[PDB]
Design a protein around this ligand. Structure first.
Ligand SMILES: [Zn+2]
Ligand SMILES: [Zn+2]
Ligand SMILES: [Zn+2]
Ligand SMILES: [Zn+2]
Lengths: 202, 201, 202, 200
DNA sequence: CAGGCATGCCT
DNA sequence: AGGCATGCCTG
DNA sequence: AGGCATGCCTG
DNA sequence: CAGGCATGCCT
């Protein structure tokens, strides 16, 4: 039904949906990085970062893959994650684009991209047709872009979000799903090291 | 008109279970649950998420209600409302569309209906039952408690109980669970002390 | 002739104007106690409080004195001081009443006690004509009653207030002004001594 | 006139800008550091300013407030709110005053918000009112709707608030200004401003 | 009356 | 987090 | 009131 | 590339 709070629970369905991360250079300031322990991606804004998709049984036709952001804390979950006023109106980055300025998550390099603004739930998300890994390849890598900092005032300001990747049936039914925390910042590694470090303190 | 609504655990046919996820244990915490006790400690107006589990729900008309009642039998015959201060107040009454007078509110859903029993007098919030999402076990509801357990003019220092019932389109309880509730500025503090004292009398 | 921000400044005009307080009991449960150190009095909700007023020379015919509350902090200086939503209606002490339960300051005994609401500034004040001191007795004494505790939610909650006594003509201008911090509380003595002693830890 | 003067002009009647005693506490709403004519306040909190004039002015006189970046290069830029604070709803809603304006007046229903046709400059004006009986000060309540640090607006670019009085006619009478700093902790900010100024 | 607690809220 | 406010309840 | 959290800056 | 600073904000 018209679900207002997307659910974020790893649910490898009939096929075995999997979300993995490409090799990543550790550093305070690097395009991106991932924390297997804390299950959360660290990413400079607007820059490129690829996610790995793997499956066993090749999924049914018309099958797609969505990406949606949601706030981690309950106090804020009823709020849809959109871009901040600062970055949305600014031309600095999106005037020649084909994706709506307000959307947080953009897909890079794929014209088949579909930017969804649900009429009822107001939830924004980007979807693409699903496709098998290039011959002799283990993963179907999709290139995502995040257009605001987890700190952006007026947008997701300093409140952690969760990036939900959903494997969907053409009609929208759910075939798979994985989730993980995301943080768009200025210096990823550093925020990670510190976060991994602190985690270890307790 | 009198009611003293029943607060009797009835897991019912469809296995019903309103549970709680892990909340923090901070002096001031939006909310926190004491598995030890039947108490849910939370801050006023905050989002206290509650989990519902069910194995096989069927009525299309089945919906769920939450209604506040006083614990001590002396007052249970008294309707549980909002103090005059928070009702006429401007704070969480401007904007949101819910009755200024109710204590319980559903936060993330607009299908909710706030009902004022014409005879009972009781006030409660009802929302349609929507099953868990593909791959998720619980149907999560978001609740808001508009007054402090301690507000004079309202329930002043009177332990209260929230009763969640899963009824069929028309008054027929498919089951219910109940828990004690305290609304305060500092939930963490009150639990450490509450659970504490309760042990070794 | 309406000002948005009543002045709290004292003003001993042509007629010498001074407002004094009779002997103050130190008891904690005491109905009221005045502090000349802090120039601040402590009351209990709706308890009779004598305010001794004095003039060096007698004033015009129908001139009066008005008691208008005002906040101490600028952050709030604009909020007209009114009775807490709760009290502005609870029937204890209005079914008795003759005055708008909205009004905070009000007199006891005098049936010539008038009230005012500038439709311009919406200010709530009380007015009573200068009846010469009890002939032979220096000060004229008006019995006041302050309806809400300084900590009442919905009203001045825990926000300090100034009690302004203004010497006015039958009309026209102002003729004498004396302000002093107000405070409605349960235990005036308790409170009085606590403030009063902290001022000593300067 | 685009890019106006901050120059001090006491005037026929002596116009003086004064700040009552403020707090020295870190999170105090506002404070003033006499050492450096600089006002520290919090976004949207009530900044009161004491205005004393020697003699009573004409019937059409009034007081206006206008922000102006400090540094040479930036002065040419109009001082408006960042986009986030302008579109965010925190205060804008129900507020009957332009949402782009940095400066706001609080206690007046006769606040006149101005946007210059040629200049584009923004400012708030209020008809002057004589100090009240026995009061040596005429008080105006001012709000500053954007931290100085904000992007999309003052990029941590210092500004001065030039307060001038003018006739009913568009004519200047007196002028005085002081640097402004909108922040979270006024107390802290100044206490630090001075410590380092005490070095050379 | 005066001590003292429960519980909101401030730095 | 630790600690102060402050109404109200004893006794 | 102290300490943190986080974009930009510096070398 | 990481260390440090300035500035909003949390317990
Ligand atoms: Zn942004
Ligand atoms: Zn209440
Ligand atoms: Zn009251
Ligand atoms: Zn801003």
């Amino acid at each position: 039904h018209h679900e207002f709070i997307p659910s974020n629970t790893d649910y490898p369905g009939p096929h075995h949906f999997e979300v993995t991360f490409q090799q990543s250079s550790t550093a305070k300031s690097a395009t991106w990085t991932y924390s297997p322990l804390l299950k959360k991606l660290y990413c400079q804004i607007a820059k490129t970062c690829p996610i790995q998709i793997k499956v066993s049984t090749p999924p049914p036709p018309g099958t797609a893959i969505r990406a949606m952001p949601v706030y981690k804390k309950a106090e804020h979950v009823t709020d849809v994650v959109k871009r901040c006023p600062n970055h949305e109106l600014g031309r600095d980055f999106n005037e020649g684009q084909s994706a709506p300025a307000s959307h947080l998550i953009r897909v890079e390099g794929n014209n088949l991209s579909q930017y969804v603004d649900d009429p009822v739930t107001g939830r924004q998300s980007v979807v693409v047709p699903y496709e098998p890994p290039q011959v002799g390849t283990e993963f179907t890598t999709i290139l995502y872009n995040f257009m605001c900092n987890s700190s952006c005032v007026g947008g997701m300001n300093r409140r952690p979000i969760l990036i939900i990747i959903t494997l969907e049936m053409r009609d929208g039914q759910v075939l798979g799903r994985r989730s993980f925390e995301g943080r768009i910042c200025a210096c990823p590694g550093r925020d990670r090291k510190a976060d991994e470090d602190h985690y270890r303190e307790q």
